[PDB]
Design a binder for these strands. Structure first.
Ligand SMILES: [Zn+2]
Lengths: 206, 70, 141, 107, 49, 62
RNA sequence: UGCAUGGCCGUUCUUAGUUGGUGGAGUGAUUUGUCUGCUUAAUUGCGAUAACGAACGAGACCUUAACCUACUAAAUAGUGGUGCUAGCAUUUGCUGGUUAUCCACUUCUUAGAGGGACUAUCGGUUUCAAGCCGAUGGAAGUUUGAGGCAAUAACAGGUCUGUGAUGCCCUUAGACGUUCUGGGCCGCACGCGCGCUACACUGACGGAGCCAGCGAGUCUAACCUUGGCCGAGAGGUCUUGGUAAUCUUGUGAAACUCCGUCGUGCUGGGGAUAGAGCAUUGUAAUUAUUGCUCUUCAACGAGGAAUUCCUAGUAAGCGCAAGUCAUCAGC
């Protein structure tokens, strides 16, 4: 592949990974298609990254969060529940292991599986609490694409965390299971169950 | 779930038969499917790796991920 | 004498002072190779300067970085940009501009945004809470 | 004896920046006028003395704090000069609120 | 008519007012916190931020 | 069957706590037709909504 | 006695509020100006307009933090060759000692002058106004981020236990003055508030890796302490640097990072209660000051009705210095 010899030896695998920007030098961002047209602009796949660890100022403007790499948004959502706050390096490592596990179990690009999981778990309708001087009812309302992506990621990471709590299975495994089940649209997934519950409750309060 | 504390011949023979069939092999997979100890499971994986029955994908101190040798 | 540029980088309190020369092709850190970066994940973030540009330009340049201050992940990001500013400050003087703009083009168009200091400094803690914005718990009843 | 060139450190300390810069500038200018070997005014980091007290003299009210600062600005100038010229330079530049110490460099 | 007074709050009193409570020792001031805020600008401690 | 609709105009915020945005949307399959809808979270012009019922309309802000 | 007071501070309010000149309205107290609307963090502005033009407050300002291969210089900051010297390796090398043996620079570091940002420039959307929103440059485009200062006023807010600030009253030799000894402020059926540690596998434990910033520090006083030696540890001990960008200190901080050890069980999670011993400070440690060693190993399996803080280097996790300090931090 034309290996370049420098005074400091660089491993060939790293030199190969210089020509094409792959996630963790393993997984291509090419061929990663978002099946839902409405989420294309809200799921960032088109700028590839070597690791899910940018120091990007995505919070400073309303929709700049859409332009954050989707895997980084997933990483950031793992590092919650107090004791895990700020531990981004651990979260990135969990994601590496999760993607390795997904690859082995599906033989598909694990980035695609993550995208498919997010598209499938995003609730289309939700209920809002509307009240008119004392009494409050639920009103059915449509959900914005950015909210769909946000809820999808939240449901996946909460489900995976609860499944890993006081269980022998690691967070990497439970997250991989949750993502694979969500990508297949399986009613075993916490995220799918909760999406369908919300949409059913919305339909009932229409 | 019940979990093994001593190795045991019948469990040893099962490890050798079943672990090559599994597409994904990790400490948890052994514990769930083979009612084995978590730390018997780590010893078993190191043995099966030495015999070349399973291939390591990723070795981390907290998580070891193996595949079947195709 | 040989050509010399004394570039630097920073994130937070880290200050990674690079030195680039007309060299053989060593890309050093403290006094150790690029494979000596114990942040296992953040190997690839100090790689990016020499990955996404061209190998060939890294075959005749002695880069070596002296990192002080900051913390582990601020060290990574300080070094990175001191490398990615090092070659650009080298290519400024002793290389064509049309080449030197393709360094800046290939970097800045990746969503790298090396920039310089990511200007986010810590907002001071002010009295009446443990944080800057956070306040101690109020009682009422 | 008088013509023996001595290496001397003049240290300037003050709370007031303007006076301290004026004195420092005057010493440097006088050293130039007499063609003395000078290492110019090295600005040391300003020491910020910080005292934080509770605003209230009693227990009452919201827990509000005041922070007072005294800033100490320190500079030094190294000169190689005969003893006679040094005594002249130091006497000319006495400004109120600038402290002036003179140290003879003995190795 | 006297007892140990080498250390502790009994030893150290304010320059101004002779109170033991709430002293500031930092930088060898030995001025009570109340009296300090009175004579802060006189000494040369000015507020800024 | 779900109908896709594109946001053509943000009309304003509705609901007592201001957590809902009224939007006008055009259908992707029929650009002649527009309806008013309530969107929950943050929304912009040119965003795509999924409509589980296409005929219903949100009552206009007075 | 704060309900006799001063000063100070808290609160209303750090909200946006307050006032007069000339004109108009009204016999007058007074009123309009100081407003339907849109806008702003803002009585900030646009605009409407019997008002016009102004002032205090807001803003500006001041301190601080982010940029400036541009200046000004520096061993008490730092770099690059050289003097020098040690190992790996022959290819000059690569990696380090020797802080003034030395020379030259000032990028990094320091702080002194100045510059830089004004929503710049462009595209949308509105009384095509104030503005707002998008995009591109830029160090930075949320008042650029954070404070400081903060009007007219008020309150029977708190303080007479900060004061040789103070009225009056009480007390004044068996004192409610002062000082010494000992005790007490800590005393425990219980109710409430701020907190620390937890409930584990994203974890505990063991080895290894190994990175900050703000600080402070003794001359006639015992201050911060390096290095060596003794000790399981706490500590002891012999010397030395430092009145401090120099020495302590690169405060090799913690989380975290790697490779191991455990395996879902109140478990190796949790470390209360309790016993024995050995140090340290001090005139004095008993009602354990505190630290260290072994042993003892409780509740707690994510917390009812309620309810607090919070919009970017922020929340939250994480430790460090300072204050107090002879000694003692869950503050
Ligand atoms: Zn006093």
């Amino acid at each position: 592949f034309t290996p370049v010899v420098l005074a400091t030896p660089i491993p060939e695998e790293v030199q190969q990974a210089q020509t094409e920007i792959k996630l963790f030098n393993k997984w291509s961002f090419e061929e990663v298609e978002v099946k839902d047209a409405s989420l294309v602009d809200y799921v960032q796949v088109r700028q590839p990254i070597f690791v899910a660890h940018t120091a990007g100022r995505y919070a400073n403007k309303r929709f700049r969060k859409a332009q954050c790499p989707i895997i980084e948004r997933l990483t950031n959502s793992l590092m919650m529940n107090g004791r895990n706050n700020g531990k981004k390096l651990k979260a990135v490592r969990i994601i590496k292991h999760t993607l390795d596990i997904i690859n082995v179990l599906t033989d598909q690009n694990p980035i695609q599986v993550v995208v498919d999981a997010i598209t499938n778990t995003g609730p289309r309708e939700d209920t809002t609490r509307v009240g008119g001087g004392g009494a409050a009812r639920r009103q059915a309302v449509d959900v914005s694409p950015l909210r769909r992506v946000n809820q999808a990621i939240a449901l996946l990471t909460i489900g995976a965390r609860e499944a890993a709590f006081r269980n022998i299975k690691t967070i990497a495994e439970t997250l991989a299971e949750e993502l694979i089940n969500a990508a297949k649209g399986s009613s075993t997934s916490y995220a799918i169950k909760k999406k369908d519950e919300l949409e059913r409750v919305a339909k009932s309060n229409r | 779930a019940q979990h093994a504390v001593i190795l045991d011949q019948e469990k040893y023979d099962r490890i050798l038969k079943e672990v090559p069939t599994y597409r994904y092999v990790s400490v948890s997979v052994l514990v769930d499917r083979l009612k084995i100890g978590g730390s018997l499971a780590r010893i078993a994986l190191r043995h099966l790796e030495k015999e070349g029955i399973i291939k390591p994908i990723s070795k981390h101190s907290k998580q070891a991920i193996y595949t079947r040798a195709t | 004498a040989v050509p010399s540029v004394q570039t630097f980088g920073k994130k937070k309190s880290a200050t990674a002072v690079a030195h680039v020369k007309a060299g053989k092709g060593l890309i050093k850190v403290n006094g150790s190779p690029i494979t000596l970066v114990e942040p296992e994940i953040l190997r690839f973030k100090v790689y990016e300067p020499l990955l996404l540009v061209g190998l060939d330009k890294f075959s005749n340049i002695d880069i070596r970085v002296r990192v002080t201050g900051g913390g582990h992940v601020s060290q990574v990001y300080a070094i990175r940009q001191a490398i990615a500013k090092g070659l650009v400050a080298y290519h400024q003087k002793y290389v064509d501009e049309q080449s030197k703009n393709e360094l800046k083009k290939a970097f800045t168009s990746y969503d790298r945004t090396l920039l310089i200091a990511d200007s986010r400094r810590p907002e001071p803690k002010k009295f009446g809470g443990k944080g800057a914005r956070s306040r101690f718990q109020k009682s009422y009843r | 004896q008088q013509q023996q060139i001595i290496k001397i450190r003049i240290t300037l300390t003050s709370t007031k920046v303007k006076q301290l810069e004026n004195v420092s500038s005057n010493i440097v200018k006088n050293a130039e006028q007499h063609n003395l070997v000078k290492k110019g005014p090295v600005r040391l980091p300003t020491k910020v003395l910080k005292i934080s007290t509770r605003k209230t003299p009693n227990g009452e009210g919201s827990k509000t704090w005041e922070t007072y600062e005294m800033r100490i600005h320190k500079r030094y100038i190294d000169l190689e000069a005969p003893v006679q010229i040094v005594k002249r330079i130091t006497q000319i530049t006495i400004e109120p609120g600038v402290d002036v110490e003179v140290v003879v460099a003995s190795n | 008519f006297s007892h140990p007074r080498r250390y502790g709050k009994g030893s150290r009193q304010c320059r101004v007012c002779s109170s033991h409570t709430g002293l500031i020792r930092k930088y060898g001031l030995n001025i009570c916190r109340q009296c300090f805020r009175e004579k802060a600008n006189d000494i040369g401690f000015n507020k800024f931020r | 069957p779900v109908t896709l609709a594109k946001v053509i105009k943000v009309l304003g915020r509705t609901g007592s706590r201001g957590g809902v945005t009224q939007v006008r949307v055009e259908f992707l399959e029929d650009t002649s037709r527009t309806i008013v809808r309530n969107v929950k979270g943050p929304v912009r012009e040119n965003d795509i909504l999924v409509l589980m019922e296409s005929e219903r309309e949100a009552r206009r802000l007075r």
